[PDB]
Amino acid sequence: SKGEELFTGVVPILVELDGDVNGHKFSVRGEGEGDATNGKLTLKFICTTGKLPVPWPTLVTTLVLCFARYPDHMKQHDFFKSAMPEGYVQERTISFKDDGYYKTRAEVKFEGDTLVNRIELKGIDFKEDGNILGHKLEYNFNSVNAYITADKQKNGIKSNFKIRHNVEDGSVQLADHYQQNTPIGDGPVLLPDNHYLSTQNALSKDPNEKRDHMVLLEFVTAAGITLGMD
């Protein structure tokens, strides 16, 4: 596959999300750019339907792993870029412990010059006074290593990892993530060996923005495979 050659520069990004959590409907639109050479994403997200009915941090994982920085000695394990430009489907179940769950289905693929992440999210069985629908989570996002394994019986990859959201009262809300990715096209894809993505996030606000929004800076770097340019 040649897909990785589409990410050697800076690539504009468009993210569109339609959400429905316990019948609370919402939409989010994000725009920015990705720089896979550095593993860097810079995006600004707007709730275009007004008030976001869930905390912005609970949407970070849902709102483009093709922008991870794979070190040279690991380029053969980069499933995400290998599927491009046709893209992949990314599906998750995110189970909030002692609370509801998200089910997400996204298509990550190039539309023209732009990498687009288009997502359908349904949230079910949440508590209306819980940490999610109650907006009890701090506006931040801790750093995380998320392990990838190949899924040969689906021609894709899978991953499960735990996101720990800080609660305003000092407790921690667990979001257990189960993820599946499978290509859209029929071309060749890279099935990686076991490894992980190391991710850091900085969440902020745009002073001149009145809408409900999230400014996001994110770094994603692949690791977990031995040797590589001492």
Experimental method: X-ray
Q: How many domains does the chain have?
A: 1
Residue 136: C-alpha distances to residues 38, 48, 58, 222 (Å): 33, 22, 11, 32
The three state secondary structure string of the chain is CCHHHHHCCCEEEEEEEEEEECCEEEEEEEEEEEECCCCEEEEEEEECCCCCCCCHHHHCCCCCHHHCECCHHHHHHCHHHHCCCCCEEEEEEEEECCCCEEEEEEEEEEECCEEEEEEEEEEECCCCCCCCCCCCECCCCCCEEEEEEEEHHHCEEEEEEEEEEEECCCCEEEEEEEEEEEECCCCCCCCCCCEEEEEEEEEECCCCCCCCEEEEEEEEEEECCCCCCC
The verdict on residue 228 lying in a domain is: no
Among 140, 146, 163, which Cα is nearest to 68's? 146
* Closest to 138 measured CA to CA, from 38, 56, 77: 56
For residue 229, tell me if it sits in a domain.
no
Assess if residue 116 is contained within a domain: yes
Give bridge partners of residue 40 from the DSSP assignment: 35, 219
Beta-carbon contacts of residue 161 (< 8 Å; ≥ 6 apart): 144, 145, 146, 147, 177, 179
Q: Work out whether the CA dihedral 194, 158, 189, 154 comes out positive or negative.
A: positive
Count of CB atoms situated within 10 Å of the CB of 134: 15
Strand 213-223 relative to strand 40-47: parallel, antiparallel, unpaired?
antiparallel
Q: After which residues is the chain broken (C to N over 2.5 A)?
A: 63
Indicate the pairing of strand 195-204 with strand 24-35.
unpaired
Domain hosting residue 90, numbered range = 3-223
Asked if residues 83 and 189 have their Cβ atoms less than 8 Å apart, the reply is yes
55 exposure class (CB count in 10 Å sphere: 0-12, 13-18, 19+): buried
In a domain, 141, yes or no: yes
Provide φ and ψ at 134, rounded to 5°.
Answer: -85, 0
Question: Which has the closest alpha carbon to 174: 74, 73, 100?
Answer: 100
| CA dihedral of 77, 80, 83, 87, whole degrees rounded to 10 | 170
Q: Is the CB of residue 116 less than 8 Å from the CB of residue 110?
A: yes
Q: Is 160 exposed, middle or buried (0-12, 13-18, 19+ CB in 10 A)?
A: middle
Residue 230 within any structural domain of the chain: no
For residue 98, is it left (φ>0), alpha (ψ between -120 and 50) or beta? left
- At 180, which CATH number? 2.40.155.10
Altogether, the residues listed in the chain come to a count of 230
Residue among 85, 69, 11 nearest 219 (CA) = 69
